[PDB]
Design an enzyme around this catalytic site. Structure first.
Site, PDB file in Angstrom:
ATOM      1  N   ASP B  89       0.871  -1.199   0.000  1.00  0.00           N
ATOM      2  CA  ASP B  89       0.000   0.000   0.000  1.00  0.00           C
ATOM      3  C   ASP B  89       0.900   1.238   0.000  1.00  0.00           C
ATOM      4  O   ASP B  89       0.837   2.062   0.920  1.00  0.00           O
ATOM      5  CB  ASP B  89      -0.914  -0.087   1.213  1.00  0.00           C
ATOM      6  N   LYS B  91       0.963   3.714  -2.307  1.00  0.00           N
ATOM      7  CA  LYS B  91       0.298   4.923  -2.763  1.00  0.00           C
ATOM      8  C   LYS B  91       1.258   5.807  -3.565  1.00  0.00           C
ATOM      9  O   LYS B  91       1.457   6.993  -3.278  1.00  0.00           O
ATOM     10  CB  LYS B  91      -0.325   5.697  -1.585  1.00  0.00           C
ATOM     11  N   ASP B  94       3.832  10.324  -7.540  1.00  0.00           N
ATOM     12  CA  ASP B  94       4.844  11.243  -8.094  1.00  0.00           C
ATOM     13  C   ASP B  94       4.771  11.173  -9.615  1.00  0.00           C
ATOM     14  O   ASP B  94       3.906  10.481 -10.193  1.00  0.00           O
ATOM     15  CB  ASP B  94       6.209  10.862  -7.523  1.00  0.00           C
TER      16      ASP B  94
HETATM   17  O1  LIG Z   1      -8.575   5.116   1.796  1.00  0.00           O
HETATM   18  C1  LIG Z   1      -7.728   4.436   2.380  1.00  0.00           C
HETATM   19  C2  LIG Z   1      -6.610   3.781   1.773  1.00  0.00           C
HETATM   20  C3  LIG Z   1      -5.774   3.052   2.526  1.00  0.00           C
HETATM   21  N1  LIG Z   1      -5.946   2.893   3.889  1.00  0.00           N
HETATM   22  C4  LIG Z   1      -5.040   2.013   4.647  1.00  0.00           C
HETATM   23  O2  LIG Z   1      -5.794   0.891   5.114  1.00  0.00           O
HETATM   24  C5  LIG Z   1      -5.452   0.613   6.501  1.00  0.00           C
HETATM   25  C6  LIG Z   1      -6.612   0.924   7.413  1.00  0.00           C
HETATM   26  O3  LIG Z   1      -6.287   0.368   8.682  1.00  0.00           O
HETATM   27  P1  LIG Z   1      -7.320   0.371   9.901  1.00  0.00           P
HETATM   28  O4  LIG Z   1      -8.333  -0.709   9.603  1.00  0.00           O
HETATM   29  O5  LIG Z   1      -6.442   0.014  11.066  1.00  0.00           O
HETATM   30  O6  LIG Z   1      -7.969   1.730   9.997  1.00  0.00           O
HETATM   31  C7  LIG Z   1      -4.199   1.438   6.790  1.00  0.00           C
HETATM   32  O7  LIG Z   1      -3.004   0.696   6.538  1.00  0.00           O
HETATM   33  C8  LIG Z   1      -4.334   2.632   5.854  1.00  0.00           C
HETATM   34  O8  LIG Z   1      -3.050   3.134   5.522  1.00  0.00           O
HETATM   35  C9  LIG Z   1      -7.030   3.470   4.539  1.00  0.00           C
HETATM   36  O9  LIG Z   1      -7.259   3.312   5.730  1.00  0.00           O
HETATM   37  N2  LIG Z   1      -7.837   4.243   3.745  1.00  0.00           N
HETATM   38  O1  LIG Z   2       4.878  18.410  -9.171  1.00  0.00           O
HETATM   39  C1  LIG Z   2       5.939  17.833  -8.920  1.00  0.00           C
HETATM   40  C2  LIG Z   2       6.401  17.448  -7.620  1.00  0.00           C
HETATM   41  C3  LIG Z   2       7.596  16.853  -7.487  1.00  0.00           C
HETATM   42  N1  LIG Z   2       8.428  16.603  -8.568  1.00  0.00           N
HETATM   43  C4  LIG Z   2       9.758  16.004  -8.350  1.00  0.00           C
HETATM   44  O2  LIG Z   2      10.743  16.970  -8.709  1.00  0.00           O
HETATM   45  C5  LIG Z   2      11.794  16.342  -9.494  1.00  0.00           C
HETATM   46  C6  LIG Z   2      11.766  16.829 -10.920  1.00  0.00           C
HETATM   47  O3  LIG Z   2      12.967  16.362 -11.534  1.00  0.00           O
HETATM   48  P1  LIG Z   2      13.376  16.778 -13.021  1.00  0.00           P
HETATM   49  O4  LIG Z   2      13.859  18.198 -12.955  1.00  0.00           O
HETATM   50  O5  LIG Z   2      14.485  15.816 -13.327  1.00  0.00           O
HETATM   51  O6  LIG Z   2      12.201  16.578 -13.927  1.00  0.00           O
HETATM   52  C7  LIG Z   2      11.583  14.842  -9.336  1.00  0.00           C
HETATM   53  O7  LIG Z   2      12.314  14.309  -8.229  1.00  0.00           O
HETATM   54  C8  LIG Z   2      10.080  14.710  -9.102  1.00  0.00           C
HETATM   55  O8  LIG Z   2       9.802  13.554  -8.335  1.00  0.00           O
HETATM   56  C9  LIG Z   2       8.053  16.970  -9.854  1.00  0.00           C
HETATM   57  O9  LIG Z   2       8.765  16.804 -10.832  1.00  0.00           O
HETATM   58  N2  LIG Z   2       6.815  17.549  -9.951  1.00  0.00           N
END
Ligand SMILES: O=c1ccn([C@@H]2O[C@H](COP(=O)(O)O)[C@@H](O)[C@H]2O)c(=O)[nH]1
Ligand SMILES: O=c1ccn([C@@H]2O[C@H](COP(=O)(O)O)[C@@H](O)[C@H]2O)c(=O)[nH]1
Lengths: 256, 256
Positions: B89, B91, B94
């Site tokens: 998870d 998420k 970037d």
């Molecule tokens: O919308 C979301 C997405 C992920 N999660 C993840 O799911 C888990 C929820 O755990 P919980 O049942 O202990 O509240 C936890 O690891 C969160 O990071 C959410 O709770 N909500």
């Molecule tokens: O809106 C965003 C936020 C973060 N970044 C981060 O900034 C860096 C951009 O690198 P660059 O100049 O090589 O394209 C890179 O580490 C991305 O993860 C974005 O490029 N855009």
């Protein structure tokens, strides 16, 4: 409009923002290096050589093949020597209870070494409340992602307005934004803009570039974040100096 | 409406979705354990004891204090033995160029051991394109976060519709959603719902709970994701069985 040095003294300024604004003014740099490398040795050699040219070094600790906390200790030594902040671009984006653990714990212990982190606002304000529980006691700051540089970004209109409200309601911990432009009218907040190169173009995975003059001068942002425009150049020190001089003059010419 | 076993055979089914749907039907479980622990030994003891009760074990590798790749090898042994998928998870949220490195590389090498990962859609479709360039060759799947369980979530209305479009346009790699409800009318896609407990309530950092009957039966989701409702209970095996039976009966009663 106030200089960086005057903004460092504003009544509502966060201590981390103040420290940053003071070293920006002292060193004449509003450049953040995006140190997008996989080797600790290359990260540290870039930090040492480019340290004098930058206000901030942005990390992605989770792409460092040979991460250890000792590497972070050496990076802090260089940040203290050359005077720049460390910003881990972790983009926390989970429920509050989870991000608190991701910030403090695990193998990276991000809060132990990062002056600044950032968060997406999409989960609601619990993401900030969770981070701030670790970050406030550790005297850290946070940036909220109000706008993104990538093609198809949904961080527009009401989303951007929600990020600004969330920042302005958590000013004890939130010190500014990742944005493409000035999004807050409050001068206490920092605007940091990625998607920056001197030349027009993009990458093959949705990155879009604008110039330092466009984002600092026309769009009113404070700091440029530059990765490949520096990292892929042969002479990364001269590239850093080109970006520093571009961003600094764009800032001065907006001041008058 | 089709059974999990029939959905496993749909023409457009992704192989990872098919594997999951087949073991859901075989084991009579639509429960995903959210293994939100900091000790490898606790993670592995939960995986072994609860393995027979779950279709999936969801990790946050970045909150493990003693992560090693050998811990993930041991988790894979248990996933193969007991027949469940591993879902990190993470998420991802970037630009495409960055998430490809965060998925394949660094310390965690997530793509080497995770059957499933997830991504936020806010950066635009480049986040999926970047992930899929690592995940397609490694025969992996991805979930898009269409709705979020937390108070103040901005993943509503047009945002949710954008996540569904992005999934349905990247069906070679995207196998479903994190959502609070059925958001796609296409039965090839999985709906996984966190924010689940048997009792009404929440946490102190914006988490909101709904019951398995509500989310599977009334809201039409496929899988419940349960952390603290199991992890904080004394007998985590009996707690897992209570959640499994609740989610499974809610699924059967919607089928008729
Ligand atoms: O919308 C979301 C997405 C992920 N999660 C993840 O799911 C888990 C929820 O755990 P919980 O049942 O202990 O509240 C936890 O690891 C969160 O990071 C959410 O709770 N909500
Ligand atoms: O809106 C965003 C936020 C973060 N970044 C981060 O900034 C860096 C951009 O690198 P660059 O100049 O090589 O394209 C890179 O580490 C991305 O993860 C974005 O490029 N855009």
């Amino acid at each position: 409009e106030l200089s960086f040095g005057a903004r460092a003294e504003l009544p509502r300024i966060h201590p981390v923002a103040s420290k940053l604004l003071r070293l920006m003014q002292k060193k004449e740099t509003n450049l953040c290096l995006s140190a997008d490398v996989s080797l600790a040795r290359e990260l540290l050699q870039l930090a040492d050589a480019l340290g004098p040219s930058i206000c901030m070094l942005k990390t992605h600790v989770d792409i460092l093949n040979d991460f250890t906390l000792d590497v972070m200790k050496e990076l802090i030594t260089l940040a203290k020597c050359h005077e720049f902040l460390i910003f881990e671009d972790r983009k926390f984006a989970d429920i509050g209870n989870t991000v608190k653990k991701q910030y403090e714990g695990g193998i990276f212990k991000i809060a132990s070494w990062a002056d600044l982190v950032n968060a997406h606002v999409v989960p609601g304000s619990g993401v900030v409340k969770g981070l701030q529980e670790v970050g406030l006691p550790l005297h850290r700051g946070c940036l909220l992602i109000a706008e993104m540089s990538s093609t198809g970004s949904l961080a527009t209109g009401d989303y951007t307005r929600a990020a600004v409200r969330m920042a302005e309601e958590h000013s004890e911990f939130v010190v500014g934004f990742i944005s493409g432009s000035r999004v807050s009218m409050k001068p206490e907040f920092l605007h940091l803009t990625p998607g920056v190169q001197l030349e027009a173009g993009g990458d093959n995975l949705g990155q879009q570039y604008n110039s330092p003059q466009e984002v600092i001068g026309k769009r009113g942002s404070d700091i440029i974040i530059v990765g490949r425009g520096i990292i892929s150049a042969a002479d990364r020190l001269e590239a850093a100096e080109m970006y520093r001089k571009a961003a600094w003059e764009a800032y001065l010419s907006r001041l008058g």
